[PDB]
Chain length 177, copies 2
């Protein structure tokens, strides 16, 4: 199955799953975020080849479906397979409000699991170090910069080129507070 057909399947599923959803505080669709995370992942493969690239790209597109949508793990396993479902679960803090995992346990499990899932989190965090919403106070931007530093420390092992990019984005983000 062609890489672009893997993307399309996950992309249409995500566009449906996130249909009511914007970027926080923006009229723009949440799909804007997912497009950037998937692109970072496919660009990462050019600077260090990824095993199971097609499934990893689907995980990049689908990584918010269990947290933010009516999507179930059984739906992901049946349509995309165990490796994709497990990736989305690994990247989910909470499956809706429910029993939220702490950042320590969440990053540890990503560090000890398949490297492709940790790489998707690196790409997600690179995407989230765009300039912050105008609404964010100094303390909120500082907190986010700090949590970014922990993500690089705990998950940067997963892909050297992507870790270098995330380090550069973290250094850049400092100017915003």
């Amino acid at each position: 199955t062609h890489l672009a057909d893997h993307y399309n399947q996950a992309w249409l599923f995500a566009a449906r799953a996130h249909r009511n959803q914007t970027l926080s505080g923006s009229p723009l669709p949440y799909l804007v975020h997912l497009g950037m995370v998937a692109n970072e992942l496919l660009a990462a493969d050019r600077d260090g080849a990824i095993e199971r690239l097609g499934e990893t790209l689907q995980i990049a597109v689908l990584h918010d479906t269990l947290e933010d949508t009516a999507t179930s793990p059984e739906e992901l396993r049946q349509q995309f397979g165990e490796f994709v479902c497990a990736g989305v679960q690994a990247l989910s803090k909470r499956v809706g409000d429910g029993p939220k995992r702490s950042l320590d346990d969440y990053l540890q499990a990503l560090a000890e699991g398949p490297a492709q899932y940790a790489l998707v989190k690196l790409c997600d965090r690179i995407t989230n170090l765009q300039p912050p919403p105008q609404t964010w106070n100094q303390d909120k931007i500082a907190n986010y910069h700090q949590e970014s530093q922990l993500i690089l420390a705990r998950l940067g092992h997963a892909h050297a080129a992507t870790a270098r990019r995330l380090r550069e984005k973290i250094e850049h983000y400092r100017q915003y507070y």
Copy 2:
């Protein structure tokens, strides 16, 4: 500067320009189409390296901005440069107002110009050979299939792997009518 930074600048620009625009008879944002076309372009590079990949990826994201949005050639030239502006113009049948070019002239100009612009048109047509919209009759699906065969004939020289993928998509599409 990084391929993902090129994508992000064009992607945010396109999300805003196309903000009040949907897919054909679907409530999903038009951005769903642009994500697939840009992903096809980046995937094509893995099967045959593209000169000026970053700018070509921006053209893939921006290719409908002059036809469908308030965007001016001036804004594209100032923000993305002449090569991107010229690509979007090459891929525009009409720039908002001004006469519509006929397909013969449009395809000839893409065939005789920069191959990267022709490659973006191959990726667009690949994307458009998903199952047809549920409101198209047999004659319309047949007409679209026929136009697709003309695009492969006139533009397939631009990238051998992508022409092979378009031929496969054209063969698959016959099933829908």
